[PDB]
Design an enzyme around this catalytic site. Sequence first.
Site, PDB file in Angstrom:
ATOM      1  N   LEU A 184       5.501 -12.359 -45.568  1.00 49.32           N
ATOM      2  CA  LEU A 184       6.809 -12.865 -45.135  1.00 49.32           C
ATOM      3  C   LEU A 184       7.784 -13.049 -46.289  1.00 49.32           C
ATOM      4  O   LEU A 184       8.999 -12.882 -46.086  1.00 49.32           O
ATOM      5  CB  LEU A 184       6.675 -14.190 -44.357  1.00 49.32           C
ATOM      6  CG  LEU A 184       6.048 -14.018 -42.974  1.00 49.32           C
ATOM      7  CD1 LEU A 184       5.779 -15.404 -42.414  1.00 49.32           C
ATOM      8  CD2 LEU A 184       7.014 -13.281 -42.077  1.00 49.32           C
ATOM      9  N   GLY A 185       7.287 -13.406 -47.475  1.00 50.12           N
ATOM     10  CA  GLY A 185       8.155 -13.559 -48.632  1.00 50.12           C
ATOM     11  C   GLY A 185       7.369 -14.149 -49.775  1.00 50.12           C
ATOM     12  O   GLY A 185       6.255 -14.632 -49.605  1.00 50.12           O
ATOM     13  N   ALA A 225       8.405 -17.711 -57.125  1.00 48.58           N
ATOM     14  CA  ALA A 225       7.655 -18.480 -58.112  1.00 48.58           C
ATOM     15  C   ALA A 225       6.664 -19.447 -57.457  1.00 48.58           C
ATOM     16  O   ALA A 225       5.590 -19.697 -58.014  1.00 48.58           O
ATOM     17  CB  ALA A 225       8.621 -19.240 -59.027  1.00 48.58           C
ATOM     18  N   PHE A 226       6.981 -19.947 -56.259  1.00 47.69           N
ATOM     19  CA  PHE A 226       6.122 -20.924 -55.593  1.00 47.69           C
ATOM     20  C   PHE A 226       4.774 -20.341 -55.172  1.00 47.69           C
ATOM     21  O   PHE A 226       3.814 -21.105 -54.968  1.00 47.69           O
ATOM     22  CB  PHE A 226       6.816 -21.442 -54.350  1.00 47.69           C
ATOM     23  CG  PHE A 226       6.945 -20.394 -53.269  1.00 47.69           C
ATOM     24  CD1 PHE A 226       8.067 -19.603 -53.198  1.00 47.69           C
ATOM     25  CD2 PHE A 226       5.925 -20.176 -52.353  1.00 47.69           C
ATOM     26  CE1 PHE A 226       8.185 -18.624 -52.222  1.00 47.69           C
ATOM     27  CE2 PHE A 226       6.043 -19.203 -51.389  1.00 47.69           C
ATOM     28  CZ  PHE A 226       7.186 -18.421 -51.324  1.00 47.69           C
ATOM     29  N   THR A 259       3.259 -17.304 -52.163  1.00 43.03           N
ATOM     30  CA  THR A 259       3.489 -16.216 -51.214  1.00 43.03           C
ATOM     31  C   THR A 259       3.301 -16.781 -49.822  1.00 43.03           C
ATOM     32  O   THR A 259       2.375 -17.577 -49.611  1.00 43.03           O
ATOM     33  CB  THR A 259       2.501 -15.086 -51.438  1.00 43.03           C
ATOM     34  OG1 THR A 259       2.584 -14.630 -52.803  1.00 43.03           O
ATOM     35  CG2 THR A 259       2.770 -13.910 -50.508  1.00 43.03           C
ATOM     36  N   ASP A 285      15.120 -31.035 -51.022  1.00 42.04           N
ATOM     37  CA  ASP A 285      15.476 -29.638 -51.157  1.00 42.04           C
ATOM     38  C   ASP A 285      16.032 -29.100 -49.849  1.00 42.04           C
ATOM     39  O   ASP A 285      15.668 -28.003 -49.423  1.00 42.04           O
ATOM     40  CB  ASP A 285      14.278 -28.788 -51.607  1.00 42.04           C
ATOM     41  CG  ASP A 285      14.666 -27.395 -52.076  1.00 42.04           C
ATOM     42  OD1 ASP A 285      13.717 -26.566 -52.139  1.00 42.04           O
ATOM     43  OD2 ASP A 285      15.856 -27.078 -52.357  1.00 42.04           O
ATOM     44  N   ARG A 291      18.297 -22.056 -46.762  1.00 38.16           N
ATOM     45  CA  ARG A 291      17.071 -21.276 -46.930  1.00 38.16           C
ATOM     46  C   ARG A 291      15.838 -22.041 -46.470  1.00 38.16           C
ATOM     47  O   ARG A 291      14.791 -21.403 -46.223  1.00 38.16           O
ATOM     48  CB  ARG A 291      16.885 -20.869 -48.391  1.00 38.16           C
ATOM     49  CG  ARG A 291      16.701 -22.090 -49.312  1.00 38.16           C
ATOM     50  CD  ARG A 291      16.535 -21.734 -50.818  1.00 38.16           C
ATOM     51  NE  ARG A 291      16.563 -22.990 -51.576  1.00 38.16           N
ATOM     52  CZ  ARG A 291      17.659 -23.574 -52.052  1.00 38.16           C
ATOM     53  NH1 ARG A 291      18.858 -23.017 -51.904  1.00 38.16           N
ATOM     54  NH2 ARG A 291      17.539 -24.744 -52.693  1.00 38.16           N
ATOM     55  N   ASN A 292      15.932 -23.366 -46.333  1.00 45.15           N
ATOM     56  CA  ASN A 292      14.809 -24.205 -45.938  1.00 45.15           C
ATOM     57  C   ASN A 292      14.965 -24.724 -44.522  1.00 45.15           C
ATOM     58  O   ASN A 292      14.385 -25.771 -44.162  1.00 45.15           O
ATOM     59  CB  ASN A 292      14.611 -25.351 -46.937  1.00 45.15           C
ATOM     60  CG  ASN A 292      14.038 -24.849 -48.239  1.00 45.15           C
ATOM     61  OD1 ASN A 292      13.389 -23.785 -48.283  1.00 45.15           O
ATOM     62  ND2 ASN A 292      14.311 -25.569 -49.317  1.00 45.15           N
ATOM     63  N   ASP A 348       9.735 -27.316 -45.824  1.00 43.59           N
ATOM     64  CA  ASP A 348       9.654 -27.473 -47.291  1.00 43.59           C
ATOM     65  C   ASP A 348      10.034 -28.873 -47.789  1.00 43.59           C
ATOM     66  O   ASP A 348      10.603 -29.033 -48.873  1.00 43.59           O
ATOM     67  CB  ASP A 348      10.485 -26.410 -48.009  1.00 43.59           C
ATOM     68  CG  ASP A 348       9.768 -25.074 -48.042  1.00 43.59           C
ATOM     69  OD1 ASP A 348       8.512 -25.103 -48.015  1.00 43.59           O
ATOM     70  OD2 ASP A 348      10.432 -24.015 -48.065  1.00 43.59           O
TER      71      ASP A 348
HETATM   72  C1  N7Q Z   1      15.670 -17.878 -46.550  1.00 45.18           C
HETATM   73  C2  N7Q Z   1      14.670 -16.937 -47.246  1.00 45.18           C
HETATM   74  C3  N7Q Z   1      13.234 -17.252 -46.790  1.00 45.18           C
HETATM   75  O1  N7Q Z   1      12.844 -18.411 -46.835  1.00 45.18           O
HETATM   76  N1  N7Q Z   1      12.488 -16.226 -46.366  1.00 45.18           N
HETATM   77  C4  N7Q Z   1      11.194 -16.502 -46.004  1.00 45.18           C
HETATM   78  C5  N7Q Z   1      10.848 -16.802 -44.676  1.00 45.18           C
HETATM   79  C6  N7Q Z   1       9.516 -17.127 -44.339  1.00 45.18           C
HETATM   80  C7  N7Q Z   1       9.138 -17.419 -43.024  1.00 45.18           C
HETATM   81  C8  N7Q Z   1       9.471 -16.553 -42.052  1.00 45.18           C
HETATM   82  N2  N7Q Z   1       8.966 -17.003 -40.855  1.00 45.18           N
HETATM   83  C9  N7Q Z   1       8.315 -18.121 -41.098  1.00 45.18           C
HETATM   84  N3  N7Q Z   1       7.637 -18.904 -40.217  1.00 45.18           N
HETATM   85  C10 N7Q Z   1       7.029 -20.010 -40.647  1.00 45.18           C
HETATM   86  N4  N7Q Z   1       7.106 -20.364 -41.982  1.00 45.18           N
HETATM   87  C11 N7Q Z   1       7.786 -19.596 -42.840  1.00 45.18           C
HETATM   88  N5  N7Q Z   1       7.835 -20.049 -44.126  1.00 45.18           N
HETATM   89  C12 N7Q Z   1       7.176 -21.185 -44.566  1.00 45.18           C
HETATM   90  C13 N7Q Z   1       7.831 -22.173 -45.323  1.00 45.18           C
HETATM   91  C14 N7Q Z   1       7.133 -23.321 -45.752  1.00 45.18           C
HETATM   92  C15 N7Q Z   1       5.784 -23.472 -45.469  1.00 45.18           C
HETATM   93  O2  N7Q Z   1       5.034 -24.525 -45.907  1.00 45.18           O
HETATM   94  C16 N7Q Z   1       5.695 -25.762 -46.290  1.00 45.18           C
HETATM   95  C17 N7Q Z   1       5.745 -26.697 -45.239  1.00 45.18           C
HETATM   96  C18 N7Q Z   1       4.957 -26.572 -44.095  1.00 45.18           C
HETATM   97  C19 N7Q Z   1       5.033 -27.498 -43.034  1.00 45.18           C
HETATM   98  C20 N7Q Z   1       5.918 -28.571 -43.146  1.00 45.18           C
HETATM   99  C21 N7Q Z   1       6.695 -28.680 -44.289  1.00 45.18           C
HETATM  100  N6  N7Q Z   1       6.606 -27.728 -45.331  1.00 45.18           N
HETATM  101  C22 N7Q Z   1       5.101 -22.493 -44.757  1.00 45.18           C
HETATM  102 CL1  N7Q Z   1       3.408 -22.652 -44.374  1.00 45.18          CL
HETATM  103  C23 N7Q Z   1       5.798 -21.372 -44.320  1.00 45.18           C
HETATM  104  C24 N7Q Z   1       8.382 -18.445 -42.446  1.00 45.18           C
HETATM  105  C25 N7Q Z   1       8.553 -17.109 -45.385  1.00 45.18           C
HETATM  106  C26 N7Q Z   1       8.898 -16.801 -46.722  1.00 45.18           C
HETATM  107  C27 N7Q Z   1      10.223 -16.536 -47.013  1.00 45.18           C
HETATM  108  O3  N7Q Z   1      10.600 -16.176 -48.303  1.00 45.18           O
HETATM  109  C28 N7Q Z   1      10.248 -17.126 -49.300  1.00 45.18           C
HETATM  110  C29 N7Q Z   1      11.032 -16.829 -50.595  1.00 45.18           C
HETATM  111  O4  N7Q Z   1      12.411 -16.593 -50.277  1.00 45.18           O
END
Ligand code: N7Q
Length: 269
Positions: A19-20, A23-24, A26, A137, A141-142, A155
Amino acid sequence: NQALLRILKETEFKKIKVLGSGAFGTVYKGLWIPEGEKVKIPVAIKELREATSKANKEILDEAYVMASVDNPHVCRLLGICLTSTVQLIMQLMPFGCLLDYVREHKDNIGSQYLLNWCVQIAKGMNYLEDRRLVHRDLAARNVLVKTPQHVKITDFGLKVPIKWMALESILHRIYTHQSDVWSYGVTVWELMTFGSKPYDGIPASEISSILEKGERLPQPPICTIDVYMIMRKCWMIDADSRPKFRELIIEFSKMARDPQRYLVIQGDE
Ligand SMILES: *CCC(=O)Nc1cc(-c2c[nH]c3ncnc(Nc4ccc(OCc5ccccn5)c(Cl)c4)c23)ccc1OCCO
């Protein structure tokens, strides 16, 4: 309430697509396949970069908090897998992050959608405030998009985001619900500009001097003065003079009942 967080075995989830990344670590799209059930649940799996040195018990304590959030506009941690890395599992949000959604759809987004997102984000943040949780944060984007009119903040609980930070966070590392309100105002600005970059092309180290001089992000063309005034109140230097999230829910809910009065979008009038 431990039952709210699943400790997942490595067999119980499968990383299928990317999905993306950054630095954090994947994030993967994949499946949660709980043992002794007959279901395959679409999930996102965030694998944090391996750290050289907190112990499991402290990580589980924070994860229990993230699993305890119960609000339609805050993402909930469904499960965790602790190995050499921390892997966080949550429901898949199929439309991705709101920043990229608004950029992709910038010619097809109406005023009621925009204002509804502002309400939903304020509701999630007000919930975090009721839980005494500071996000630190918040940014477009979050915010993740479950469906086009159901968004959720992610996040919390986890490069310093200078351009979203309240001045007192930049200068003194103070983070409060009222510095989250500052970030909320920047997030609304991102939505109302269809995903423009705040202070585009300005080095992070120059931002504090911009704010100190009284300069702020500009009024988005579609925003009427009433909407921009809310955003400006979020960027007061005095943190206690900024709106509270409970007030922002009320004000944006009122605007969402007459969206054409408050935003003038491409093609209106
Ligand atoms: C705006 C750019 C971006 O963020 N792009 C990305 C999107 C996603 C993404 C896409 N669909 C998703 N569904 C569910 N989750 C994510 N990402 C995601 C974010 C945080 C966390 O864990 C932290 C957390 C969990 C629960 C409660 C609070 N915090 C998870 Cl497990 C999943 C989805 C993913 C990556 C992307 O790119 C990242 C770098 O730009």
